[PDB]
Chains A and B, each alone.
With several copies, the nearest count.
Chain A
Amino acid sequence: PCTQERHYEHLGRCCSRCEPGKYLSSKCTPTSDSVCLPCGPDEYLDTWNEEDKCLLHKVCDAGKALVAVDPGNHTAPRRCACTAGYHWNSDCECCRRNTECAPGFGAQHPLQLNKDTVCTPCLLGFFSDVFSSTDKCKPWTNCTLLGKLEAHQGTTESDVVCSSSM
């Protein structure tokens, strides 16, 4: 009796699996154990395996707006992400443009790489007057900094109006 973790059965024999970084070149015979060989250039296997051949790393195609965040090796897969302004969509298997936040709403920060924009309504004293996937709500102008007075108050969609009166 033996564990499925590092071993497998074949011809009424308990044989040893191949370590990550190696593939199963030939199965165990009645006279010898498994033969495991290193994965070739740009190939990997990430588990203890009985695998015929190694897996080729995915291409982080810049033409798909992808970039490697982790290169991978003979032991680990390559990790890609969509470049700024886009996020991975598993339906199209492609980098889709981020959702824009309407006026009165701002983009939540910190902005997460490879993830779509989360929109939040502007709080008291802040406004947003644009459609944007990156812009947060900006705070109202302080009229006093312009040497002026507050004539009319702002909304979540528009700024304060400043007046130079006497």
Chain B
Amino acid sequence: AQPFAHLTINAASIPSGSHKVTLSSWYHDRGWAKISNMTLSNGKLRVNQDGFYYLYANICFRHHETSGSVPTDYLQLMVYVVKTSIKIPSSHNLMKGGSTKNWSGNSEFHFYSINVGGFFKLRAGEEISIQVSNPSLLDPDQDATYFGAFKVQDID
């Protein structure tokens, strides 16, 4: 069986605050969320089968005026697609996206989305995970905040 995963944000477990975090809760079964021959554990997607995978993420940020004013006026909205390995405790950036923003105007709603994708060689045991800059600005919709992988070819 050919491996893949399309993981959508666990809307009931998005961390609060304004410091950068690793997202550690995603759906793997309900809605468009799915997984096959890969394993998922606290936001770390484990590769079970060696190969070249296409990796992708879509992240949406949003803020409404009923939540009060957006804290300070340095605002940089970022995603990092990160690789670790049960072998190597240390982690490294595979892909990075985002923009600096000024959401301090006087309109009721603010929105921004980031998309990234790439083709990577992955070994069994390696883990893929997502980091975001402003967790309390994350859009909890399944069509909005997600990441995935699918195998394209074997190593050889």
Contact = CB atoms under 8 A, between A and B. Distances in A.
Interface of A: 40-43, 47, 49-52, 54-56, 58-59, 61-65, 83, 85-86, 90-97
Q: Is the interface of A mostly helix, strand, loop or mixed?
A: loop
A56 B108 contact: no
A59 B141 contact: yes
Contacts of B18: 91
Q: Interface residues of B: mostly helix, strand, loop or mixed?
A: loop
Contacts of B29: 40
A43 B30 contact: yes
Interface string B34-70: 0000000000000000000000000000111111000
Given A40-B30, A42-B30, A86-B66, A59 B140 contact: yes
27 contacts: A40-B30, A41-B30, A43-B30, A47-B88, A49-B87, A52-B123, A54-B30, A55-B92, A56-B30, A56-B31, A58-B141, A61-B11, A61-B139, A63-B62, A63-B64, A63-B67, A63-B139, A64-B64, A85-B66, A86-B66, A86-B108, A92-B78, A92-B109, A94-B109, A94-B111, A97-B65, A97-B108
Given A64-B64, A95-B64, A55 B31 contact: yes
A93 B63 contact: no
B147 to A, nearest CB: 17
A90 B20 contact: yes
Counting from the closest, the 10 A-B pairs by CB-CB distance are A56-B31, A97-B108, A65-B66, A59-B140, A65-B64, A91-B20, A59-B11, A92-B76, A56-B30, A94-B109
B64 to A, nearest CB: 5
B63 A61 contact: no
A97 B66 CA distance: 10
B25 interface: no
A51 B66 contact: no
Contacts of A50: 87
Interface in B13-28: 18-20
A93 B20 CA distance: 9
B104 to A, nearest CB: 17
